[PDB]
Amino acid sequence: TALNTXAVQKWHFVLXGYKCEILA
Amino acid sequence: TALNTXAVQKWHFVLXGYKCEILA
């Protein structure tokens, strides 16, 4: 699940095996 | 502190505003 509150991004991408998360 | 090479490792890369890390 992705949460888009304000002008910030709090989503987590975990698929295949590699984990990529951007909190900017 | 390196990419999964033979034994058990993990590549660490962080540049700009993105934090992505691989795990083997």
Task: Reduce the DSSP state of residue A7 to 3 states and report it.
Answer: coil
What is the strand order of the sheet A10-15 is part of? Answer: A2-3, A10-15, A18-22, B18-21, B12-15
Q: Provide, as residue numbers in chain B, all residues whose Cβ is less than 8 Å from the Cβ of A13.
A: none
In this structure, what is the dihedral angle of CA atoms A20, A23, B3, B9, given to the nearest 10 degrees?
A: -90
Of B12, B18, A10, A3, which Cα lies nearest the Cα of B3? B12
Which technique was used to obtain these atomic coordinates? NMR
| Contact at CB, A21 and B20, closer than 8 angstroms | yes
* Least Cα separation, residue A1 to chain B (angstroms): 18
List phi, psi (to 5°) of B14.
Answer: -145, 115
In degrees, rounded to 5, the angle at the alpha carbon of residue B7 between the alpha carbons of residues B2 and A22 is 40
Contact B20 A18 (CB under 8 A): yes
Cβ contacts of A22 on chain B, cutoff 8 Å: 17-19
